[PDB]
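Work package 3, deliverable 3.1, input record:
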Amino acid sequence: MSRAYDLVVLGAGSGGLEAGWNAAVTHKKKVAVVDVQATHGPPLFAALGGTCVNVGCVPKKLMVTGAQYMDLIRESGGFGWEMDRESLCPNWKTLIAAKNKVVNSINESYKSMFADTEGLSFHMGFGALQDAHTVVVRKSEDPHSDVLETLDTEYILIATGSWPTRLGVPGDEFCITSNEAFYLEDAPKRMLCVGGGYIAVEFAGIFNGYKPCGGYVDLCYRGDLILRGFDTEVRKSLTKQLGANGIRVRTNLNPTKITKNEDGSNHVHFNDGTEEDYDQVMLAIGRVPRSQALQLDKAGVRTGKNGAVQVDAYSKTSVDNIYAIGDVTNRVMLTPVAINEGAAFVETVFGGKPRATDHTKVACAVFSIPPIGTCGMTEEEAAKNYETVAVYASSFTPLMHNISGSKHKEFMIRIITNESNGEVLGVHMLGDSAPEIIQSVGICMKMGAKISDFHSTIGVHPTSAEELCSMRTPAYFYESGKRVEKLS
Amino acid sequence: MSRAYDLVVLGAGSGGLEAGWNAAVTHKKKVAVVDVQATHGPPLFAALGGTCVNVGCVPKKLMVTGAQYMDLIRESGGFGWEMDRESLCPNWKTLIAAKNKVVNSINESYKSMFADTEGLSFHMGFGALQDAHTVVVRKSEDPHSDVLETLDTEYILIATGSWPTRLGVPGDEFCITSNEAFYLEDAPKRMLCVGGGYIAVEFAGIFNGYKPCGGYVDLCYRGDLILRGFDTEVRKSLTKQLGANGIRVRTNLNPTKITKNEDGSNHVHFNDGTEEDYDQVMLAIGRVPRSQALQLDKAGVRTGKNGAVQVDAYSKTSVDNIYAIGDVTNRVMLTPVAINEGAAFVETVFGGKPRATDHTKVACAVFSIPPIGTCGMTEEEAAKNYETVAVYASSFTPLMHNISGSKHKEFMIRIITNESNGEVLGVHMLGDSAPEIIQSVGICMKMGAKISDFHSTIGVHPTSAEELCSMRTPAYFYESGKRVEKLS
Ligand SMILES: Cc1cc2nc3c(=O)[nH]c(=O)nc-3n(C[C@H](O)[C@H](O)[C@H](O)COP(=O)(O)OP(=O)(O)OC[C@H]3O[C@@H](n4cnc5c(N)ncnc54)[C@H](O)[C@@H]3O)c2cc1C
Ligand SMILES: Cc1cc2nc3c(=O)[nH]c(=O)nc-3n(C[C@H](O)[C@H](O)[C@H](O)COP(=O)(O)OP(=O)(O)OC[C@H]3O[C@@H](n4cnc5c(N)ncnc54)[C@H](O)[C@@H]3O)c2cc1C
Ligand SMILES: NC(=O)C1=CN([C@@H]2O[C@H](COP(=O)(O)OP(=O)(O)OC[C@H]3O[C@@H](n4cnc5c(N)ncnc54)[C@H](OP(=O)(O)O)[C@@H]3O)[C@@H](O)[C@H]2O)C=CC1
Ligand SMILES: NC(=O)C1=CN([C@@H]2O[C@H](COP(=O)(O)OP(=O)(O)OC[C@H]3O[C@@H](n4cnc5c(N)ncnc54)[C@H](OP(=O)(O)O)[C@@H]3O)[C@@H](O)[C@H]2O)C=CC1
Ligand SMILES: CCc1ccc(-n2c(-c3ccc(SC)cc3)cc(CN3CCSCC3)c2C)cc1
Ligand SMILES: CCc1ccc(-n2c(-c3ccc(SC)cc3)cc(CN3CCSCC3)c2C)cc1
Ligand SMILES: CCc1ccc(-n2c(-c3ccc(SC)cc3)cc(CN3CCSCC3)c2C)cc1
Ligand SMILES: CCc1ccc(-n2c(-c3ccc(SC)cc3)cc(CN3CCSCC3)c2C)cc1
């Protein structure tokens, strides 16, 4: 059969714009790409470029880079750099301004991409499914608003991503999320970050860097140790170093009631029954797939837990012509994962050579201060899945920190290997440059690197990374899930 | 036969202290270690710990880290950090002071290593050879000064390293080297670095950071492009960026005569017949192996060109019981190379399991601002002895530099592959975090990584290293030595 478009992508995101571009350029198909708005902005935060560009990776990193100067300016003193250190506080207003300039600049380059690419058209509005071949674009999220466009397509691709989750406590509406955090007029003096995940830990670092005079940031998590699912020794050292940096880490604590005050501040009720006032309260509870308004039922597309889209290894839904990638599938919620999922989708339906995304042994990072760089299994998980595992560990304060005054900044590397093989199953790093090192570590790992391949490599001196090639003797072992000091 | 010691190490350096420690601790041998002095200091700069610790890797990196703050403080302004930027210059003498404290505490750490290790003893003086089994320790470098100790040994190891080379021009003795650079009480306003190698480029960066008001650093090089043997596109982009940062790169220029003025400053005559005044003039001509005073002839050990000790793959000299490692062999003059050479020497003669150092595919770095991170062949060399080579290239100005103001800071990656099989022969990087990334790149290359292994790895976003996994189509090719735009 013959229709108007070959592909209609719902969501101009990291994955969406990858599949859209590739189909249109290398295969010269006719691709329509639907998104909510053109440039970044408060009313509906996401835009052209997805969460990555608008309210995610890109702006986050810039603000984490901005916050990192607080330490660096302090650290410079030991090396001979003298200036006014008296109540040295930063300008939040000129950070957001500069941030907006860059985000908008990327918003503009994606806009001119559509004009420069034949077959690639942008369609502003709220895309929703009608049937297996028809995507309806509406004026608002409300399914009774005006119908802007009716797109007739061979294939549909859902890349609408995810949305912040909120807790069902009274006064929920008075709290902000990562979305609102980007567009705050002023940096908060009294800041509460709720949750112990990626966003919570990262933004606690941002606010702590940009807090005004005498300000403070409280991170509160409902459990024992923050960042569940990461290397426990890394998590412990990270809690210790966030503390040393100023952030008051608060475990086994959770808000139950929030009330609005007359002066503007927020009154918060906790688990232990204590009461406190915070200028802003951010919720980093996690991200649920954004698919509750797409009407997947009307096409026969299976909706799992939290609205996730049931896909096979090749991203294909219950309907043979409809596909889904990125956060909306709830597999591995990262930008480069969604991009790979998109490029694979093109290679399959329009390329002739099908490929599935390798979701295993994927190197990711946490952009806290200091940052985490990880790839592979935790020692807890590898113990459950393997006969006998060796745990290599190394901690150090870099020589420069003896001069800088930040003697709390301990670089940590922990390698988890299969004892039988020698195969590296996990590498976990904490410290500066850790997200940069973990990248080429991940090239070794999916390549199937052994611990012998590491320490036989001649090091690069002086670097933090050279320590990867100096770990030969394991600290301890796991034997059939049991922690042992030596091998029987 | 049984003698006083089974190992005498001449030179307590990176290689020396590696072989010394290992023989004494893991194999319980009686190891004597000779070095010139105990702690770092001007008269004879090198000490316990070698050049690396005292007048090399360690103090250099610290000073480069301090100089890097000049940029970071300027870059902070765009992110919202306000301060007195008016005439902001650093304190050189408090940097040197802090540097000394760190170097000294390592000198002390090595001193208490000898006291805590049995069999391992330190012998202060000038070691020289008597015969195949006897090493004489003298009061001074003059071979007629008092004989301090006479050491009787089964095996001799030469790890005396290298020494700065000087150019045979009138006024040579008025110039400093890297040695004296560490102990100048004042930072020069008018600075000339002579040469285009590692030391020249790194120290030009240091002085440029630590110059007083209205000060300038001129780097002058004998040839056309600085840093021969490195990726030509990296060198060009470095020259451009050293320029942009303040360092005046002057090529095809070489001093001919130097005279000392009455005010203290130095008058320099150049290649183009021009005259100029510099407060200090550093010679980075290179490093010749330190072997002129050891009397290798007396024992029958072959000295090659420049005085380099001729050795086989296992570091064994002309005599079966005398060995040599590190800079003194003039193979690959790096610290971690000398360490590997030392650890192998022990494994061979005391471990019973012989091993040679893999001098090929060694990842190293240049700690300029911005720094270089390299591993493997240049495209010129790979063209000279391969059938067809593919040259992958990528240049980009990181997103944060749109806010910071340093839009000259371009990150560069160039991969050079054997087109036949896809094998990566060289990876060349220029920019921040480059020496940190290149480490785990060298693990891939030692494993024999293919270009497919790179671009198949899911990236880490946002980083500079994620670009390493996004290079798929080559920019151009080399076909039987000739530069081609495509394959015929
Ligand atoms: C604060 C934050 C920081 C992050 N930092 C990192 C990081 O540093 N590194 C990393 O790897 N990952 C990071 N992530 C995760 C990453 O942003 C996501 O995994 C990635 O964006 C997923 O890509 P996607 O295409 O599936 O979703 P998106 O890129 O978000 O694309 C979804 C798009 O679909 C559009 N859309 C929604 N509904 C409709 C509809 N009704 N019709 C049409 N269009 C619609 C939206 O406007 C949105 O722009 C971060 C996330 C957050 C929230
Ligand atoms: C300024 C500078 C910066 C450098 N930076 C780096 C870097 O960042 N990364 C890197 O990998 N490499 C770097 N290097 C090179 C590196 O330091 C050397 O390659 C390394 O030190 C070689 O080790 P070695 O044991 O052979 O020599 P050394 O470590 O220098 O040991 C030689 C020792 O022998 C002693 N000795 C000399 N003569 C006698 C004798 N007559 N009797 C007894 N003892 C004697 C000396 O006192 C000296 O301490 C740098 C070098 C310099 C000069
Ligand atoms: N690569 C990167 O740099 C980044 C990646 N991301 C991605 O996007 C996703 C965004 O998640 P983000 O919000 O951190 O949260 P993610 O789920 O990581 O983390 C959620 C955190 O909130 C806690 N939490 C969950 N529910 C509640 C509740 N009801 N009350 C209190 N606390 C609760 C969780 O604790 P518990 O462990 O007990 O469930 C967990 O610590 C991540 O999964 C990640 O994949 C996001 C930011 C940066
Ligand atoms: N890994 C690291 O971070 C470091 C490693 N090192 C090691 O120590 C060694 C020490 O030497 P380092 O200063 O680089 O210099 P190296 O010899 O590399 O470089 C010397 C530079 O000086 C130039 N030169 C040589 N002779 C003359 C002359 N007669 N007149 C003018 N210029 C001359 C050379 O130019 P030309 O190209 O024309 O010959 C070259 O550019 C290095 O080879 C390196 O192996 C040193 C410092 C840091
Ligand atoms: C018109 C052809 C084209 C292709 C790719 C990009 N692109 C892209 C790009 C962005 C999004 C997509 S689709 C999600 C595809 C390509 C990013 C970047 C940023 N950086 C630049 C230096 S080389 C490394 C990458 C660039 C340059 C731009 C234009
Ligand atoms: C007495 C026990 C001992 C032995 C060696 C080191 N060491 C050494 C070391 C290096 C070379 C030698 S032989 C030249 C001997 C000791 C180096 C470094 C640098 N380090 C690497 C590990 S994490 C922090 C940074 C360290 C910590 C320390 C303790
Ligand atoms: C000769 C045996 C030796 C060698 C290196 C170290 N070392 C070193 C070390 C690092 C690099 C080098 S390379 C010259 C040498 C020694 C660092 C640190 C970290 N230190 C931990 C205790 S409190 C202060 C911080 C330590 C402990 C110690 C002993
Ligand atoms: C296909 C449409 C397109 C292409 C390229 C960019 N882009 C981009 C770009 C950057 C990030 C993204 S989101 C991953 C998308 C595009 C950057 C730059 C310039 N420079 C390159 C080196 S990295 C810093 C910026 C450019 C030119 C944007 C959109």
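Residues 385 and 481 of chain B are 8 Å apart (CA to CA).
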